[model samples]
Target: MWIIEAEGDILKGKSRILFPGTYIVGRNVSDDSSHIQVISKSISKRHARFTILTPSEKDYFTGGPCEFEVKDLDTKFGTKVNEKVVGQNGDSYKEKDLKIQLGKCPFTINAYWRSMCIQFDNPEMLSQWASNLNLLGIPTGLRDSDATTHFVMNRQAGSSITVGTMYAFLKKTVIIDDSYLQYLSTVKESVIEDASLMPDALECFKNIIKNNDQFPSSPEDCINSLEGFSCAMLNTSSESHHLLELLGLRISTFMSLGDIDKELISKTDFVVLNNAVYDSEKISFPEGIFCLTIEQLWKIIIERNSRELISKEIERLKY
Candidate 1:
């Protein structure tokens, strides 16, 4: 499933999670005439039509089943994805926060996973998921900086993938630590958040490294690396705990990759932690918004990590 949300101009706040289908967008479009209405005089009655690409087709371009695209229909003013114009028959590659324009009016469209993307009512659920992914050595390839958190995956030129698809791929390839996930599921966020919780987070991290049958190495370096990060995380203000936990998961993910990038990890950790503190005190929202925010932060980190991994690989091959 995919979601398309509207942004910019008068057509703000309308959205839908749709199955694979062809959608028409324009002004004054009826239920039958168009799937989505753009709501502006600048748009023609049937300004554009977007078609979802299948998984098989996406895999051809991305080296994996990732993002889908939108096609342009015959319209008076033409259509564009980002700022590049599309032909009457051309399609848009997968992109996030995609801007679609008909004439001068533009709407921002954000695509996300309808199923695999995480959501929670409280902080405990968030922490448990983060912990399990970290403990299991799942590299989320997620990064967050400049208030924007996205996945860190490589894509061909003009290719875009969704967070849900990324999660699906990760689940298929990695051995998820279900036991830890289940155990964390049983604990409440309030309990985990308590400063004096059982089995300290850092200790739990060390044990995961020590017990991993695959690591086959001493845990000293792992513990040493985690110690500084753990201390800094501990020293963080209480409000930033959720972000720290998520960062801890990313740190674990980076560490598990064998050739650890300490500088990269530290830079990312501080960027996310800084944003977390800012968002916590500055933004006013209902109780559970933080959980949603962190999930986004995690996704951004995943995107960054993937890009970094791919770039390094390409650079190494050049020599």
Candidate 2:
């Protein structure tokens, strides 16, 4: 139940509040349309559309930050955020406050919880599904971003491949299918992983990665390097934890650092900080403790035994 407010000086204090729905904003939108009526000549008849929505179940389950989106409907002037023309005819999704320059009137969009987006293998044909998903309370046709969690495709066009397919693989997202649309058509429940009905399509993605030798940052590379090393983190980042833990390092987070006092800290092999220094209020580390960030940790592990490096291990993954 987020209240998205579009505030601008040109509104004369008639700022518009947004919610989870589709809306058209313009100066001259036929006067009968229930769209945003702004007072600016730099605006077009159909300036832009705001699609704000709550996050996906994935975010709610794992607990991540959320954001909303703004799409420019092509104006003579254009749309801008972050001091750039994000898109005169594109979608811009943000995790925090979106300060926008809609034509001549600068506006600030205040909202929370970024909406989830889907990218189609064939956008032209699957464009209709974008609208369907939108009406069903999903964000789409925004030219993919980090918020885009699903790579949507089907057997409709006979085994089509897209660049986003590779991206979905790297992002470790679910490659969904037409059954997703079929289910959303009627059931209309939470868009959960249970909605994924295509496993063969999944196998296709799996094989693509299997065929490739090695590309992604593989944790297996350091499995032998840090064997049996006990470590602790000064901060938290889920990915960093998973990587460090998977590399065969035993970890106890700062979540329990209070329990694991300085005595335990001094006994540990390494202490990981997330690229930040400890607070001044905190006790300083002992002289012998290998206090390092994940980056420095990798460098030291790979640079072990002086100038002697692991032969056959290319620079592709060494720190």
Candidate 3:
């Protein structure tokens, strides 16, 4: 319905919690090379489009250009800049391309454009894509396993806390799986094995536990284990499983989404949760499943931002 920068002043500090009808605006040439303006509804006087030139290559367009297909596509990133889905083919701007040119003229999109564009549609699929920022320990709110899985390959090269936190929120609301739990073990080892990644990974896990709500008395033991694990995070011990727990949950999201390479699991630094490696299998239905995941993903991210503001204040003893 609407989009707002995760961190922009237009809405003051509440940009991440953008109102449903709000659209994050940017400047880009319409496919026809029209004038640049802030993007919005075609008919609304407020309708503006950004006049930046498209990259030399193509690949963007969420597809179809129809409202429904557009909806599904927008769900991938959680919102839309406007109703426009214009794109050429054989060459959408890939990650590397975006960095090559910094929108030569500053056509007018807020900084979060990259964050908003890369999110996957399936809330459960967060583990599949890991950015460099995640490996560095930023924690942009993405699920635990996704962070770990990404870490498995890329180690803190170019991930963002913005997306990491976004994924974290998804983990909070969506159902989790066992495979994700196992992946956590690998993530923990990955962080510990490498000195540079330990501190940040520990902090990220601490934040996740601090933010999550432990429930149902049956989970009390798990909660206690987590609390102890948190202390270990604050401390420094080779046996520390703080990062492991974080990676476990992070990977669980991937397991829920689909089958990961079984070979990856064997050599995976992940710990098996409840001694189980797989989740009860099921296929995701497009209409209900896709929409539900997207909605929850956005909802949790908005919640995470608000909660984080308060957490930061508390940390500063401002409250």
Best-fitting candidate, measured by lDDT? 2
Mind sharing the TM-score for model 3? 0.19
Provide the overall lDDT of each model, using Cα atoms, as 2-decimal numbers.
0.40, 0.52, 0.26
lDDT of 1: 0.40
* lDDT for position 73 in model 2: 88
Off by over 4 Å in 1: 32-34, 57-67, 110-319
Best candidate, TM-score-wise?
1
* lDDT sort, best first: 2, 1, 3
lDDT of 3 at 182: 40
Worst 10 residues of 1 by lDDT: 144-153
**Alpha-carbon shift of residue 137 in model 1 (angstroms):** 27
Clashes of each: 20, 4, 55
Q: Is candidate 2 or candidate 3 better by TM-score?
A: 2
Cα displacement (Å) at residue 207, model 2:
58
Q: How far off is residue 145 in model 2, in Å?
A: 26
Give the per-residue lDDT digits (tens) of candidate 1, residues 18-115.
33446676776754312666677667787777665434322222333224456655666776777788775676565434566666665555555332
Off by over 4 Å in 2: 6-17, 30-34, 62-67, 107-319
TM-score of 1: 0.33
lDDT, candidate 2, at 244: 63
Q: Is candidate 1 or candidate 3 better by TM-score?
A: 1
